[PDB]
């Protein structure tokens, strides 16, 4: 059996598992993790090849669905999360589509939250219904809407919490109880919080999906994703789509991302603490009307955040205090005055970034769509990196004034 | 515009285009092609960000659907093929699934050849019909069967020629005429032949798909794919699925494969010549019942091969002279005796490889499914690489005797 | 001019420059740093090629002595350290040999401390004297020996502080004062401390050398090094040796190392605090005779450590309390009982490591030379990484007990 | 023993060795060669660490002086060349300096040809003499000049053949005889010719050095070098300098180069034949006064080239038929009129390149020194790649006319 990882002592913590969990060392006894850039494998005999295709031996067969470097990434993340099983993908969106596709054929039914990442909303509203799926949307923060949608038989439920940019929350445990009553499996997209700040499995969720592109990489280099869940689910319908539709993670990208996992704990710790300080600063500034951050007392669901998350995260959203007449122009002026923070759409990088949601991601849905979620022309979003917290505050203060 | 590549002089040949086509050099004037390992991009102002997101400027936005290193690979392949447009993918199977997914929603109709790569068969017969597609199979070599299937309105047609592993041929110009009369778009998988030996666009084909994993890489290092076709098709339904379901090619993999394209011409030429000699050797050997190779005069469709191919390829298939009930035992005996050729399930590598399809690549079909395409327990497939031709003939002669 | 980097706002801290200092973005405006795998460059005209070779333009010419990715690593490290100029090398030993060779021809004079890294001692005692250099050794902690050796004109002075494994110190300001009166340039090897815990330039050191292989990488992946000093020295005798003897840094390694520099601050902070706790735990343990760690108040040179260092570092040395005739057996027993920490001779990794110096680190010098410095068969050295401090203490306590 | 490579069948040809020589597959049985990006190694026990440091086991210890991936490159090149031993380096100039330095201390004597690569001349005339070496230069093509210089007991002899750009030759067999009678060791730099067109070891040469940056890579991507000679030389004085001065090859670079070795045979074959055709074209053009290429019958040393080389190489030198006082102006016009070939100083790339030696390659010589070797302002050098030969001839013809 060639896939058994190096054993760790009983009871080690999340940080230890990030540094050395899941390792598969060769006979050369290299300290750091090897990179197997190969698409295929060789066999000692024809009988061994037959047995490998049958599943009687765990010999590697083809990198589209199994590679020794990819195996290290999958096991390390599985142990950090506390999941039964895991499967790596080419991107975060490949993880979302394939996880849902594994649950939903033509004639099946999906109930989802409306406040989603742009591409996740397109998968749920257009792409899967073109293949015969029935999709119903609800406001994620309204349990009576969830209950109404789930009183007919349902195959799957999908949501993100917190949402982006408005940072609205879903009550995880309450929604999972309702979902199970209707026969559905619950898929949670956990990119905003990371596995350090929010754990869905102890709250009854069936499947958790990640983007590796964001905090896991941590430095903006490559793309990747992962699907996490039950052994039966991962080895069954998920494996089948992965093998035959081929949205496969590169062994090079796996190497980058498994090395990113070693410093995840300390990077999230520092950025969470920095974002908390920055939200408090913005909350006292005379040029600012309101701030949204889950661990700030002004948040409408502050009390729920304190029970289901261990920190607020690495993103702060806020509105400028000016007439709506000049709000777009004022927001543009603020972005253009930054000297340290870069103007960019991404999240989860060591470099700090700023964006104007209303004219980028949410420009499609138009004025009516935006006003329904409270997203005005004066709203700005900042993604907090690893720069000195006082250097960041100085750049923001100068940009506002 | 940042995306216009360095123009080559008029009338330059395929070899020249493979070495220097599609380049986009930076201000540093590097001779060799740069690798942009980034997931996102920055903007000079909030206005430029808004316009870029709207597609009003050609500034890069997010690497899941556009990256400067991926663009060099796409353009280089487009020019070698003679196609209107191209989109890179995570694997050859992601190119197959996504190309057909862009043409077929629930309620649409596909006519396909039966003689296919294992995973392509699974896509056509199980995966797409689960999402509501109606699939009809035919024997690719029977034009009267094509005629009967295409006598009603049809959305898509799919086939490989020559087929993997039986090397059955499909008359491209003739099937295309029938498909267009039914309103269908024709997708050709051109992996076995490569762009050097067979060109489908001059014969009326609408879409060509490739696996980068095979001859394009040439040395068995990484996975990749491509979809080639109309600007309307590539930029429309193809781009929608790519952006939102995310089976994205890594910028690292793109670098490996675009460098592989520089040597494709000379590598195919050498391996085509070597395969032809090996096929002639096998055709005279006492232990061999038959040989299938398109440029051997003994091939049942030799005349059609001469019509639509400039060479036979790099793979040789043969059957052992042994009754069917004990043929597996004899095949295993032969493969186990090889000392230079590796036992492996792959092709298109500089290293020569051998496999037994009935117990590996086509095990899933079952005894009845294999019988329908003529694939018995006595069949053996050899992929020919760059080693000395007489060294390879020596290893095979010894293994058979 | 193509080599001018993106300038940062006035007054930014060491943490901020490590994240985004020294970047040179292309016209594609990529967020993350690009990798230019090229050996050569091209020119728009013959006149430009002539000017470029004559050094009248700053256009790149050949990667053995200048490359755009290598320049980003050089400038980021130069910004962190506060040096006038920098040059990257293939390894730390390449930095040591080339820096000293730049100052020392046949007939020139070197004064060096005796307590050095194995390979550094071989360079000073054997390799340079074979080429005509006069080398005199002193005990690093004895200022009266420094005074006597530096009472005649001298070209170079070389030492490490703290030393490895006994962690003896050299008084930087006092030795620098004596060296300058003799006309000599002071070369400090600062690998043990890192630029985060000890800074030589404000104390009047002329040259600082680094191995990138250790804390700079931080995860045990690649080799590299650097030389930092005055503009005339780096561009003069150093440049000459680098161009023509060619111990060049690879652009791939340069990308690995520059991204490592982004997390250096938080990695060193955490490992230093962890090592302080481990030193205190060992100091109080009944199986332990003595501990050596510079920020432990019992260190014989504690007041000097507090004067020139801001933390003790990430390595802890100790001796077992047992009779010397059985100490080797006892040391081997302890190493063999570790179940989390790996047995290995390396330093500066996120993975914690343990070694026995008398049979590894300091094998060459024989038993008489080891006794001279107090390095008995009962001495053990631990390199502290990023695992949970409680999990590491548990592993050490089980191994001792 | 972990270092013994997979031996190939007896008597296999050079093409087969290039594809498969020197591999060391892991227990995962990867088809393609693995990349070990590690600086250090771990041990099973303290007793294994001790024996590994003592050289009693061949267990890897530290990547500055041994790594599994670097070993595959070393062994594959050694087998192609037919040498007793091999050691990889950071660049070709590192191979030159380290090979000579291992033979030459203060007081030792070197006899070298004058017509050397620029950096090679600096090593011999300035760098080594600064460290106490006596160096004497001769005209490489004059055997009596060799004979006089070698009547004094000598330690080392160094030369290149053919020279660049004038392509004069040295008689390998004759010079080697004269050197051995002086007790000297012969170092041949074989970069211009490659291992495939000229073999030094059968003619009594003691040491051969290579730059991997040129034809070995073949695509202009990375730097590297190698030293080949007797086992006791490689494991003695060479190893000592490599371990302690550290001009180390990166494991990433070693993967690039070992894979380029698989296609070396067919790439050299195609480029050599192409250059032959191009030399013949130029030799008949009305704008051209003369041509230098070793396999052109009108070369002044044609008979010698036929005796010691199997082809002329991939570089073509020529001079314009114009008055000397306008020659620089005319040459500049020709370079600036090219539309396919790039203006660049490099060699051995699949991309074809053009250079003007008098203002680049040989700038640091002055009018006086260029006249001595016949290098006028009208001389142009072309490096031939893998583009279609008739596409290259078309560009050159238009540029001349």
UniProtKB/Swiss-Prot annotation, chains A, B, C, D:
Q: Name one Pfam family in it.
A: Cys_Met_Meta_PP
| Cofactor(s) listed in the protein's UniProt record | pyridoxal 5'-phosphate
Please write the reaction equations for the catalytic activity of this protein.
O-succinyl-L-homoserine + hydrogen sulfide = L-homocysteine + succinate
Question: Could you describe the subunit structure of this protein?
Answer: Homotetramer.
Q: In which pathway does it act?
A: Amino-acid biosynthesis; L-methionine biosynthesis via de novo pathway; L-homocysteine from O-succinyl-L-homoserine: step 1/1
Tell me the Gene Ontology biological-process terms attached to this UniProt entry.
'de novo' L-methionine biosynthetic process; homocysteine biosynthetic process; transsulfuration
Q: What species is given as this protein's source?
A: Mycobacterium tuberculosis (strain CDC 1551 / Oshkosh)
The modified positions for N6-(pyridoxal phosphate)lysine read: 214
What is this protein's record name? O-succinylhomoserine sulfhydrylase
GO terms for molecular function, please?
carbon-sulfur lyase activity; pyridoxal phosphate binding; transferase activity, transferring alkyl or aryl (other than methyl) groups
Q: Which NCBIfam families match?
A: O_suc_HS_sulf, PRK07810.1
What would be one Gene Ontology cellular-component term for the protein? cytoplasm
Annotated keywords:
Amino-acid biosynthesis, Methionine biosynthesis, Pyridoxal phosphate, Transferase
* Principal EC category: transferase
Enzyme Commission number(s) of this protein: 2.5.1.-
What InterPro entries does the entry give? Answer: Cys/Met-Metab_PyrdxlP-dep_enz (IPR000277), O-succ-hSer_sulfhydrylase (IPR006234), PyrdxlP-dep_Trfase (IPR015424), PyrdxlP-dep_Trfase_major (IPR015421), PyrdxlP-dep_Trfase_small (IPR015422)
Recorded family membership: Belongs to the trans-sulfuration enzymes family. MetZ subfamily.
| Purpose | Catalyzes the formation of L-homocysteine from O-succinyl-L-homoserine (OSHS) and hydrogen sulfide.
SUPFAM superfamilies named among the record's database cross-references: PLP-dependent transferases (SSF53383)
């Amino acid at each position: 059996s060639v896939r058994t990882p190096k054993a760790l002592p009983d009871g080690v913590s999340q940080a230890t598992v990030g540094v050395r969990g899941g390792m598969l060392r060769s006979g050369f006894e290299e300290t750091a993790e090897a990179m197997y850039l190969t698409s295929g494998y060789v066999y000692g005999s024809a009988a061994v090849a037959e047995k490998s295709f049958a599943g009687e031996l765990d010999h590697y067969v083809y990198s589209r669905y199994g590679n020794p470097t990819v195996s290290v990434f999958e096991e390390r993340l599985r142990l950090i999360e506390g999941a039964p099983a895991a499967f790596a993908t080419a991107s975060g969106m490949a993880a979302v589509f394939t996880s849902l596709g594994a649950l939903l054929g033509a004639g099946d039914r999906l109930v989802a939250a409306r406040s989603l990442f742009g591409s996740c909303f397109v998968v749920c509203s257009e792409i899967l219904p073109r293949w015969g799926v029935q999709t119903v949307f609800v406001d994620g923060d309204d349990l009576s809407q969830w209950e109404r949608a789930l009183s007919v038989p349902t195959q799957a439920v999908f949501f993100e919490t917190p949402s982006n940019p408005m940072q609205s929350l879903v009550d995880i445990a309450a929604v999972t109880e309702l979902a199970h009553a209707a026969g559905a499996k619950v898929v949670l997209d956990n990119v905003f919080a990371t596995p350090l700040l929010q754990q869905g499995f102890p709250l009854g969720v069936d499947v958790v999906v990640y983007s590796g592109t964001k905090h896991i990489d941590g430095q903006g280099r490559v793309l990747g994703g992962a699907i996490l869940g039950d052994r039966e689910y991962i080895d069954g319908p998920v494996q089948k789509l992965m093998r035959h539709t081929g949205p496969a993670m590169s062994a090079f990208n796996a190497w980058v991302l498994l090395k990113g996992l070693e410093t995840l704990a300390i990077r999230v710790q520092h950025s969470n603490a920095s974002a908390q300080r920055i939200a408090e600063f913005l909350n006292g500034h005379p040029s600012v009307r309101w701030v949204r951050y889950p661990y700030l007392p002004s948040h409408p669901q502050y009390d729920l955040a304190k029970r289901q998350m261990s920190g607020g995260g690495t993103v702060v959203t806020f509105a400028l205090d000016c007439p709506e007449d000049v709000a777009k122009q004022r927001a543009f002026e603020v972005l253009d005055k930054m000297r340290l923070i870069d103007i960019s759409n991404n999240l989860g990088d060591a470099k700090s970034l700023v964006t104007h949601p209303a004219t980028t991601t949410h420009r499609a849905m138009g004025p009516e769509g935006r006003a329904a979620i409270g997203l005005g022309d004066g709203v700005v979003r900042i993604s907090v990196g690893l720069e000195d917290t006082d250097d960041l505050i100085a750049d923001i203060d100068r940009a506002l004034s």
